[PDB]
Amino acid sequence: DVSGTVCLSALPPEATDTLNLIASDGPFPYSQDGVVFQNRESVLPTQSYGYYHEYTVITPGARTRGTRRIITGEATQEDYWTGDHYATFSLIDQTC
């Protein structure tokens, strides 16, 4: 299930950075950025393989990718934030 919507401006600024890189098709800081996200917990709506992709959202100070990601869906303006290492997701609203 998706945990509502969240305005882009209410997320860490690195979320904005990741979306800007997605808009430019990269390049991205981590090699996993852009890999297919399989939605294995069926947390997001069911779609076929390749509908979703995942991108790092950098955590300041972290040596690793940390817990923050954006998952794109193929639909226009369909992007999911998680701040808790894929446990939950919220739809990102870039209009606010």
mmCIF file of N, CA, C and O in Angstrom:
data_model
loop_
_atom_site.group_PDB
_atom_site.id
_atom_site.type_symbol
_atom_site.label_atom_id
_atom_site.label_comp_id
_atom_site.label_asym_id
_atom_site.label_seq_id
_atom_site.Cartn_x
_atom_site.Cartn_y
_atom_site.Cartn_z
ATOM 1 N N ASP A 1 0.867 -1.199 0.000
ATOM 2 C CA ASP A 1 0.000 0.000 0.000
ATOM 3 C C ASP A 1 0.884 1.223 0.000
ATOM 4 O O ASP A 1 1.994 1.182 0.529
ATOM 5 N N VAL A 2 0.390 2.307 -0.582
ATOM 6 C CA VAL A 2 1.126 3.555 -0.619
ATOM 7 C C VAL A 2 0.614 4.456 0.496
ATOM 8 O O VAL A 2 -0.593 4.621 0.682
ATOM 9 N N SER A 3 1.555 5.036 1.224
ATOM 10 C CA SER A 3 1.277 5.894 2.366
ATOM 11 C C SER A 3 1.101 7.353 1.920
ATOM 12 O O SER A 3 1.939 8.214 2.197
ATOM 13 N N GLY A 4 0.003 7.617 1.220
ATOM 14 C CA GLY A 4 -0.353 8.956 0.804
ATOM 15 C C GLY A 4 0.605 9.616 -0.163
ATOM 16 O O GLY A 4 1.399 8.965 -0.837
ATOM 17 N N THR A 5 0.455 10.930 -0.235
ATOM 18 C CA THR A 5 1.269 11.802 -1.032
ATOM 19 C C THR A 5 2.091 12.708 -0.109
ATOM 20 O O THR A 5 1.766 12.942 1.065
ATOM 21 N N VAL A 6 3.183 13.202 -0.640
ATOM 22 C CA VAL A 6 4.015 14.149 0.064
ATOM 23 C C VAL A 6 4.534 15.166 -0.936
ATOM 24 O O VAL A 6 4.938 14.823 -2.033
ATOM 25 N N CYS A 7 4.498 16.435 -0.562
ATOM 26 C CA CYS A 7 5.077 17.461 -1.411
ATOM 27 C C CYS A 7 6.586 17.304 -1.494
ATOM 28 O O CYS A 7 7.262 17.051 -0.491
ATOM 29 N N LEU A 8 7.119 17.547 -2.681
ATOM 30 C CA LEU A 8 8.559 17.517 -2.862
ATOM 31 C C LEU A 8 9.271 18.435 -1.868
ATOM 32 O O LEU A 8 10.304 18.072 -1.311
ATOM 33 N N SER A 9 8.714 19.621 -1.637
ATOM 34 C CA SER A 9 9.344 20.580 -0.733
ATOM 35 C C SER A 9 9.375 20.121 0.713
ATOM 36 O O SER A 9 10.107 20.693 1.502
ATOM 37 N N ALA A 10 8.566 19.124 1.070
ATOM 38 C CA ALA A 10 8.535 18.552 2.415
ATOM 39 C C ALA A 10 9.537 17.409 2.599
ATOM 40 O O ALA A 10 9.658 16.890 3.693
ATOM 41 N N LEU A 11 10.227 17.021 1.540
ATOM 42 C CA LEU A 11 11.224 15.977 1.602
ATOM 43 C C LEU A 11 12.606 16.588 1.710
ATOM 44 O O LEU A 11 12.782 17.775 1.446
ATOM 45 N N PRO A 12 13.597 15.799 2.098
ATOM 46 C CA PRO A 12 14.971 16.302 2.134
ATOM 47 C C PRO A 12 15.373 16.860 0.768
ATOM 48 O O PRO A 12 14.889 16.372 -0.261
ATOM 49 N N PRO A 13 16.253 17.854 0.732
ATOM 50 C CA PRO A 13 16.602 18.482 -0.545
ATOM 51 C C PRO A 13 17.257 17.509 -1.520
ATOM 52 O O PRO A 13 17.176 17.717 -2.725
ATOM 53 N N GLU A 14 17.854 16.442 -1.007
ATOM 54 C CA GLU A 14 18.462 15.451 -1.881
ATOM 55 C C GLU A 14 17.420 14.759 -2.761
ATOM 56 O O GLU A 14 17.754 14.272 -3.832
ATOM 57 N N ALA A 15 16.151 14.727 -2.337
ATOM 58 C CA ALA A 15 15.091 14.186 -3.174
ATOM 59 C C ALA A 15 14.941 15.019 -4.447
ATOM 60 O O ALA A 15 14.713 14.491 -5.539
ATOM 61 N N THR A 16 14.992 16.339 -4.291
ATOM 62 C CA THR A 16 14.951 17.239 -5.433
ATOM 63 C C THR A 16 16.135 16.996 -6.355
ATOM 64 O O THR A 16 15.981 16.950 -7.566
ATOM 65 N N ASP A 17 17.310 16.809 -5.771
ATOM 66 C CA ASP A 17 18.493 16.500 -6.554
ATOM 67 C C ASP A 17 18.305 15.217 -7.375
ATOM 68 O O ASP A 17 18.621 15.181 -8.556
ATOM 69 N N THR A 18 17.811 14.157 -6.743
ATOM 70 C CA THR A 18 17.611 12.901 -7.452
ATOM 71 C C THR A 18 16.619 13.076 -8.596
ATOM 72 O O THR A 18 16.858 12.590 -9.697
ATOM 73 N N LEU A 19 15.517 13.777 -8.355
ATOM 74 C CA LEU A 19 14.566 14.020 -9.430
ATOM 75 C C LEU A 19 15.178 14.828 -10.563
ATOM 76 O O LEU A 19 14.882 14.564 -11.731
ATOM 77 N N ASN A 20 16.041 15.783 -10.256
ATOM 78 C CA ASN A 20 16.713 16.528 -11.316
ATOM 79 C C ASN A 20 17.607 15.618 -12.160
ATOM 80 O O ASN A 20 17.642 15.760 -13.376
ATOM 81 N N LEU A 21 18.317 14.686 -11.519
ATOM 82 C CA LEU A 21 19.139 13.744 -12.271
ATOM 83 C C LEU A 21 18.269 12.807 -13.115
ATOM 84 O O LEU A 21 18.603 12.489 -14.255
ATOM 85 N N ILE A 22 17.132 12.364 -12.581
ATOM 86 C CA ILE A 22 16.244 11.534 -13.372
ATOM 87 C C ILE A 22 15.778 12.304 -14.592
ATOM 88 O O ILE A 22 15.722 11.743 -15.690
ATOM 89 N N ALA A 23 15.467 13.581 -14.427
ATOM 90 C CA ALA A 23 15.005 14.373 -15.553
ATOM 91 C C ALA A 23 16.052 14.478 -16.650
ATOM 92 O O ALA A 23 15.702 14.579 -17.819
ATOM 93 N N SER A 24 17.335 14.449 -16.268
ATOM 94 C CA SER A 24 18.440 14.512 -17.221
ATOM 95 C C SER A 24 18.954 13.132 -17.660
ATOM 96 O O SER A 24 19.938 13.076 -18.381
ATOM 97 N N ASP A 25 18.319 12.049 -17.196
ATOM 98 C CA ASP A 25 18.767 10.661 -17.402
ATOM 99 C C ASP A 25 20.180 10.424 -16.864
ATOM 100 O O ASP A 25 20.993 9.723 -17.464
ATOM 101 N N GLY A 26 20.455 11.019 -15.708
ATOM 102 C CA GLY A 26 21.715 10.824 -15.014
ATOM 103 C C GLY A 26 22.770 11.825 -15.443
ATOM 104 O O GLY A 26 22.441 12.894 -15.967
ATOM 105 N N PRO A 27 24.040 11.504 -15.207
ATOM 106 C CA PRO A 27 24.452 10.295 -14.486
ATOM 107 C C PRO A 27 24.118 10.357 -13.000
ATOM 108 O O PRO A 27 23.842 11.433 -12.463
ATOM 109 N N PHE A 28 24.124 9.198 -12.355
ATOM 110 C CA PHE A 28 23.718 9.040 -10.971
ATOM 111 C C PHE A 28 24.910 8.635 -10.116
ATOM 112 O O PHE A 28 25.839 7.991 -10.609
ATOM 113 N N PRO A 29 24.882 8.986 -8.835
ATOM 114 C CA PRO A 29 26.003 8.687 -7.934
ATOM 115 C C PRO A 29 26.263 7.204 -7.661
ATOM 116 O O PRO A 29 27.421 6.830 -7.468
ATOM 117 N N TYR A 30 25.222 6.384 -7.625
ATOM 118 C CA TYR A 30 25.373 4.965 -7.318
ATOM 119 C C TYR A 30 24.990 4.086 -8.502
ATOM 120 O O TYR A 30 24.064 4.390 -9.240
ATOM 121 N N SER A 31 25.692 2.975 -8.682
ATOM 122 C CA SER A 31 25.465 2.143 -9.856
ATOM 123 C C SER A 31 24.064 1.539 -9.868
ATOM 124 O O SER A 31 23.537 1.214 -10.931
ATOM 125 N N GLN A 32 23.466 1.393 -8.690
ATOM 126 C CA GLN A 32 22.125 0.821 -8.562
ATOM 127 C C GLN A 32 21.061 1.820 -9.002
ATOM 128 O O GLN A 32 19.896 1.445 -9.176
ATOM 129 N N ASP A 33 21.442 3.091 -9.157
ATOM 130 C CA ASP A 33 20.481 4.115 -9.539
ATOM 131 C C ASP A 33 20.026 3.834 -10.957
ATOM 132 O O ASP A 33 20.822 3.778 -11.885
ATOM 133 N N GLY A 34 18.730 3.623 -11.097
ATOM 134 C CA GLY A 34 18.109 3.277 -12.358
ATOM 135 C C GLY A 34 17.775 1.807 -12.533
ATOM 136 O O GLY A 34 17.109 1.448 -13.502
ATOM 137 N N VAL A 35 18.204 0.957 -11.607
ATOM 138 C CA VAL A 35 17.867 -0.454 -11.701
ATOM 139 C C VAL A 35 16.366 -0.666 -11.536
ATOM 140 O O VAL A 35 15.678 0.095 -10.864
ATOM 141 N N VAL A 36 15.864 -1.723 -12.157
ATOM 142 C CA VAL A 36 14.465 -2.051 -12.002
ATOM 143 C C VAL A 36 14.176 -2.334 -10.527
ATOM 144 O O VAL A 36 14.932 -3.014 -9.837
ATOM 145 N N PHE A 37 13.069 -1.778 -10.053
ATOM 146 C CA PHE A 37 12.531 -2.080 -8.738
ATOM 147 C C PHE A 37 11.405 -3.100 -8.925
ATOM 148 O O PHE A 37 10.439 -2.823 -9.645
ATOM 149 N N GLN A 38 11.528 -4.269 -8.294
ATOM 150 C CA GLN A 38 10.591 -5.364 -8.538
ATOM 151 C C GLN A 38 9.303 -5.300 -7.726
ATOM 152 O O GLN A 38 8.399 -6.107 -7.936
ATOM 153 N N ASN A 39 9.225 -4.381 -6.773
ATOM 154 C CA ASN A 39 8.037 -4.280 -5.936
ATOM 155 C C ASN A 39 7.701 -5.644 -5.278
ATOM 156 O O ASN A 39 6.557 -6.074 -5.264
ATOM 157 N N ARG A 40 8.720 -6.278 -4.697
ATOM 158 C CA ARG A 40 8.628 -7.659 -4.197
ATOM 159 C C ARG A 40 7.716 -7.838 -2.988
ATOM 160 O O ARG A 40 7.319 -8.956 -2.682
ATOM 161 N N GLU A 41 7.429 -6.777 -2.259
ATOM 162 C CA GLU A 41 6.522 -6.893 -1.134
ATOM 163 C C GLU A 41 5.128 -6.482 -1.591
ATOM 164 O O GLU A 41 4.205 -6.388 -0.779
ATOM 165 N N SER A 42 4.996 -6.263 -2.904
ATOM 166 C CA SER A 42 3.770 -5.783 -3.526
ATOM 167 C C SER A 42 3.352 -4.546 -2.837
ATOM 168 O O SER A 42 2.155 -4.260 -2.698
ATOM 169 N N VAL A 43 4.342 -3.771 -2.426
ATOM 170 C CA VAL A 43 3.978 -2.576 -1.711
ATOM 171 C C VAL A 43 3.352 -1.562 -2.662
ATOM 172 O O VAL A 43 2.379 -0.901 -2.310
ATOM 173 N N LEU A 44 3.912 -1.417 -3.849
ATOM 174 C CA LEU A 44 3.372 -0.524 -4.868
ATOM 175 C C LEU A 44 2.351 -1.279 -5.729
ATOM 176 O O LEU A 44 2.295 -2.513 -5.696
ATOM 177 N N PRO A 45 1.534 -0.575 -6.512
ATOM 178 C CA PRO A 45 0.569 -1.265 -7.365
ATOM 179 C C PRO A 45 1.249 -2.264 -8.288
ATOM 180 O O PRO A 45 2.351 -2.064 -8.795
ATOM 181 N N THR A 46 0.558 -3.368 -8.530
ATOM 182 C CA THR A 46 1.063 -4.400 -9.412
ATOM 183 C C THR A 46 1.257 -3.872 -10.819
ATOM 184 O O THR A 46 0.345 -3.306 -11.408
ATOM 185 N N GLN A 47 2.457 -4.065 -11.349
ATOM 186 C CA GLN A 47 2.790 -3.719 -12.713
ATOM 187 C C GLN A 47 3.768 -4.766 -13.211
ATOM 188 O O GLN A 47 4.363 -5.531 -12.457
ATOM 189 N N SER A 48 3.962 -4.790 -14.508
ATOM 190 C CA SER A 48 4.882 -5.753 -15.040
ATOM 191 C C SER A 48 6.331 -5.276 -14.823
ATOM 192 O O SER A 48 6.598 -4.097 -14.470
ATOM 193 N N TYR A 49 7.243 -6.241 -14.920
ATOM 194 C CA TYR A 49 8.646 -6.000 -14.709
ATOM 195 C C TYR A 49 9.136 -4.904 -15.639
ATOM 196 O O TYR A 49 8.889 -4.935 -16.839
ATOM 197 N N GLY A 50 9.818 -3.932 -15.051
ATOM 198 C CA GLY A 50 10.374 -2.825 -15.794
ATOM 199 C C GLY A 50 9.544 -1.565 -15.705
ATOM 200 O O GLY A 50 10.001 -0.494 -16.122
ATOM 201 N N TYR A 51 8.344 -1.656 -15.152
ATOM 202 C CA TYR A 51 7.542 -0.470 -14.935
ATOM 203 C C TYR A 51 8.197 0.475 -13.933
ATOM 204 O O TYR A 51 8.088 1.707 -14.061
ATOM 205 N N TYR A 52 8.836 -0.094 -12.913
ATOM 206 C CA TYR A 52 9.436 0.687 -11.837
ATOM 207 C C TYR A 52 10.962 0.649 -11.938
ATOM 208 O O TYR A 52 11.536 -0.380 -12.288
ATOM 209 N N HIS A 53 11.611 1.760 -11.586
ATOM 210 C CA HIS A 53 13.056 1.829 -11.459
ATOM 211 C C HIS A 53 13.414 2.540 -10.176
ATOM 212 O O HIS A 53 12.628 3.323 -9.665
ATOM 213 N N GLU A 54 14.588 2.258 -9.628
ATOM 214 C CA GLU A 54 14.985 2.877 -8.358
ATOM 215 C C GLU A 54 16.269 3.682 -8.483
ATOM 216 O O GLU A 54 17.162 3.386 -9.248
ATOM 217 N N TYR A 55 16.325 4.729 -7.687
ATOM 218 C CA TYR A 55 17.408 5.704 -7.700
ATOM 219 C C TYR A 55 17.785 6.050 -6.288
ATOM 220 O O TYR A 55 16.934 6.240 -5.453
ATOM 221 N N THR A 56 19.064 6.198 -6.032
ATOM 222 C CA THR A 56 19.542 6.653 -4.743
ATOM 223 C C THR A 56 19.087 8.078 -4.459
ATOM 224 O O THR A 56 19.157 8.952 -5.286
ATOM 225 N N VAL A 57 18.664 8.313 -3.233
ATOM 226 C CA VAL A 57 18.646 9.657 -2.625
ATOM 227 C C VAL A 57 19.713 9.693 -1.540
ATOM 228 O O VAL A 57 19.650 8.977 -0.560
ATOM 229 N N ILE A 58 20.693 10.537 -1.755
ATOM 230 C CA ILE A 58 21.856 10.556 -0.891
ATOM 231 C C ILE A 58 21.482 11.006 0.518
ATOM 232 O O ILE A 58 20.747 11.963 0.681
ATOM 233 N N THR A 59 22.021 10.309 1.522
ATOM 234 C CA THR A 59 21.921 10.735 2.913
ATOM 235 C C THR A 59 23.209 11.462 3.276
ATOM 236 O O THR A 59 24.287 10.882 3.181
ATOM 237 N N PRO A 60 23.126 12.707 3.712
ATOM 238 C CA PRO A 60 24.345 13.418 4.088
ATOM 239 C C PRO A 60 25.169 12.648 5.109
ATOM 240 O O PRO A 60 24.632 12.129 6.100
ATOM 241 N N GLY A 61 26.469 12.544 4.840
ATOM 242 C CA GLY A 61 27.401 11.890 5.728
ATOM 243 C C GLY A 61 27.551 10.395 5.541
ATOM 244 O O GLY A 61 28.504 9.815 6.047
ATOM 245 N N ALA A 62 26.613 9.751 4.858
ATOM 246 C CA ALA A 62 26.608 8.292 4.768
ATOM 247 C C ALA A 62 27.711 7.803 3.844
ATOM 248 O O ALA A 62 27.965 8.372 2.783
ATOM 249 N N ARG A 63 28.344 6.709 4.245
ATOM 250 C CA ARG A 63 29.268 5.960 3.387
ATOM 251 C C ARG A 63 28.562 5.060 2.357
ATOM 252 O O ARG A 63 29.142 4.732 1.314
ATOM 253 N N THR A 64 27.331 4.657 2.656
ATOM 254 C CA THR A 64 26.545 3.760 1.803
ATOM 255 C C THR A 64 25.336 4.497 1.270
ATOM 256 O O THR A 64 25.175 5.705 1.531
ATOM 257 N N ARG A 65 24.484 3.769 0.544
ATOM 258 C CA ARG A 65 23.253 4.349 0.024
ATOM 259 C C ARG A 65 22.218 4.677 1.069
ATOM 260 O O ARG A 65 21.246 5.311 0.740
ATOM 261 N N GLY A 66 22.400 4.254 2.307
ATOM 262 C CA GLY A 66 21.440 4.582 3.326
ATOM 263 C C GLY A 66 20.042 4.064 3.029
ATOM 264 O O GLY A 66 19.880 2.979 2.460
ATOM 265 N N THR A 67 19.052 4.791 3.514
ATOM 266 C CA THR A 67 17.692 4.298 3.562
ATOM 267 C C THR A 67 16.742 5.009 2.620
ATOM 268 O O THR A 67 15.585 4.619 2.555
ATOM 269 N N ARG A 68 17.217 5.995 1.857
ATOM 270 C CA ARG A 68 16.356 6.865 1.088
ATOM 271 C C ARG A 68 16.439 6.584 -0.409
ATOM 272 O O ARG A 68 17.511 6.441 -0.967
ATOM 273 N N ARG A 69 15.288 6.495 -1.053
ATOM 274 C CA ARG A 69 15.225 6.176 -2.472
ATOM 275 C C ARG A 69 14.067 6.878 -3.120
ATOM 276 O O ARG A 69 13.095 7.191 -2.467
ATOM 277 N N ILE A 70 14.147 7.055 -4.433
ATOM 278 C CA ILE A 70 12.964 7.338 -5.244
ATOM 279 C C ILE A 70 12.780 6.181 -6.219
ATOM 280 O O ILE A 70 13.725 5.751 -6.880
ATOM 281 N N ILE A 71 11.546 5.697 -6.275
ATOM 282 C CA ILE A 71 11.148 4.704 -7.241
ATOM 283 C C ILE A 71 10.283 5.414 -8.262
ATOM 284 O O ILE A 71 9.271 5.992 -7.917
ATOM 285 N N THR A 72 10.690 5.387 -9.512
ATOM 286 C CA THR A 72 9.830 5.903 -10.572
ATOM 287 C C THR A 72 8.875 4.834 -11.024
ATOM 288 O O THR A 72 9.250 3.666 -11.126
ATOM 289 N N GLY A 73 7.654 5.238 -11.348
ATOM 290 C CA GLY A 73 6.779 4.428 -12.181
ATOM 291 C C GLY A 73 6.736 5.005 -13.571
ATOM 292 O O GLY A 73 7.015 6.177 -13.768
ATOM 293 N N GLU A 74 6.353 4.205 -14.550
ATOM 294 C CA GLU A 74 6.381 4.628 -15.935
ATOM 295 C C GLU A 74 5.387 5.742 -16.232
ATOM 296 O O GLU A 74 5.578 6.492 -17.181
ATOM 297 N N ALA A 75 4.321 5.856 -15.457
ATOM 298 C CA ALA A 75 3.332 6.884 -15.704
ATOM 299 C C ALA A 75 3.906 8.265 -15.453
ATOM 300 O O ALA A 75 4.853 8.467 -14.675
ATOM 301 N N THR A 76 3.290 9.249 -16.092
ATOM 302 C CA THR A 76 3.801 10.590 -15.954
ATOM 303 C C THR A 76 3.630 11.079 -14.514
ATOM 304 O O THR A 76 2.603 10.853 -13.863
ATOM 305 N N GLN A 77 4.693 11.668 -14.009
ATOM 306 C CA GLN A 77 4.613 12.272 -12.720
ATOM 307 C C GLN A 77 4.341 11.251 -11.602
ATOM 308 O O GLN A 77 3.740 11.645 -10.580
ATOM 309 N N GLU A 78 4.759 9.973 -11.810
ATOM 310 C CA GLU A 78 4.600 8.905 -10.838
ATOM 311 C C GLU A 78 5.966 8.586 -10.222
ATOM 312 O O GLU A 78 6.807 7.965 -10.852
ATOM 313 N N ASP A 79 6.148 9.012 -8.972
ATOM 314 C CA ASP A 79 7.414 8.827 -8.273
ATOM 315 C C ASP A 79 7.100 8.574 -6.833
ATOM 316 O O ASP A 79 6.283 9.273 -6.247
ATOM 317 N N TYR A 80 7.791 7.612 -6.235
ATOM 318 C CA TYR A 80 7.553 7.224 -4.847
ATOM 319 C C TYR A 80 8.818 7.452 -4.034
ATOM 320 O O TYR A 80 9.908 7.031 -4.405
ATOM 321 N N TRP A 81 8.641 8.126 -2.911
ATOM 322 C CA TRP A 81 9.673 8.304 -1.902
ATOM 323 C C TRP A 81 9.614 7.173 -0.908
ATOM 324 O O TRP A 81 8.550 6.819 -0.443
ATOM 325 N N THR A 82 10.730 6.673 -0.416
ATOM 326 C CA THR A 82 10.700 5.958 0.861
ATOM 327 C C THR A 82 11.835 6.531 1.687
ATOM 328 O O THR A 82 12.908 6.761 1.157
ATOM 329 N N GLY A 83 11.585 6.790 2.965
ATOM 330 C CA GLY A 83 12.621 7.220 3.881
ATOM 331 C C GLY A 83 13.027 6.154 4.870
ATOM 332 O O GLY A 83 13.825 6.420 5.756
ATOM 333 N N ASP A 84 12.501 4.943 4.706
ATOM 334 C CA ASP A 84 12.686 3.879 5.683
ATOM 335 C C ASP A 84 13.059 2.553 5.020
ATOM 336 O O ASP A 84 12.597 1.479 5.414
ATOM 337 N N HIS A 85 13.940 2.630 4.031
ATOM 338 C CA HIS A 85 14.579 1.441 3.478
ATOM 339 C C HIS A 85 13.499 0.490 2.950
ATOM 340 O O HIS A 85 13.473 -0.692 3.278
ATOM 341 N N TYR A 86 12.626 1.048 2.107
ATOM 342 C CA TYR A 86 11.600 0.310 1.349
ATOM 343 C C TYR A 86 10.455 -0.220 2.209
ATOM 344 O O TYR A 86 9.598 -0.928 1.663
ATOM 345 N N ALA A 87 10.358 0.142 3.480
ATOM 346 C CA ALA A 87 9.243 -0.349 4.284
ATOM 347 C C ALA A 87 7.954 0.315 3.851
ATOM 348 O O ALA A 87 6.933 -0.357 3.743
ATOM 349 N N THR A 88 8.013 1.615 3.583
ATOM 350 C CA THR A 88 6.858 2.381 3.191
ATOM 351 C C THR A 88 7.246 3.341 2.088
ATOM 352 O O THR A 88 8.400 3.740 1.942
ATOM 353 N N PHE A 89 6.248 3.714 1.312
ATOM 354 C CA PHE A 89 6.407 4.662 0.209
ATOM 355 C C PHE A 89 5.319 5.698 0.227
ATOM 356 O O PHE A 89 4.200 5.413 0.615
ATOM 357 N N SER A 90 5.648 6.895 -0.237
ATOM 358 C CA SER A 90 4.665 7.943 -0.469
ATOM 359 C C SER A 90 4.839 8.475 -1.881
ATOM 360 O O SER A 90 5.950 8.613 -2.360
ATOM 361 N N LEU A 91 3.734 8.809 -2.543
ATOM 362 C CA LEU A 91 3.793 9.446 -3.848
ATOM 363 C C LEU A 91 4.303 10.873 -3.702
ATOM 364 O O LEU A 91 3.837 11.609 -2.863
ATOM 365 N N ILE A 92 5.256 11.259 -4.534
ATOM 366 C CA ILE A 92 5.857 12.582 -4.473
ATOM 367 C C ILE A 92 5.092 13.516 -5.392
ATOM 368 O O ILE A 92 4.899 13.232 -6.575
ATOM 369 N N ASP A 93 4.705 14.667 -4.859
ATOM 370 C CA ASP A 93 4.033 15.698 -5.623
ATOM 371 C C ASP A 93 5.034 16.820 -5.907
ATOM 372 O O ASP A 93 5.383 17.606 -5.016
ATOM 373 N N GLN A 94 5.497 16.883 -7.145
ATOM 374 C CA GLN A 94 6.460 17.891 -7.563
ATOM 375 C C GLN A 94 5.849 19.291 -7.713
ATOM 376 O O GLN A 94 6.578 20.243 -7.996
ATOM 377 N N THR A 95 4.529 19.405 -7.573
ATOM 378 C CA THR A 95 3.882 20.687 -7.698
ATOM 379 C C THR A 95 3.897 21.503 -6.415
ATOM 380 O O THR A 95 3.445 22.648 -6.424
ATOM 381 N N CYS A 96 4.389 20.944 -5.309
ATOM 382 C CA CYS A 96 4.338 21.637 -4.029
ATOM 383 C C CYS A 96 5.555 21.346 -3.161
ATOM 384 O O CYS A 96 6.451 20.595 -3.567
#
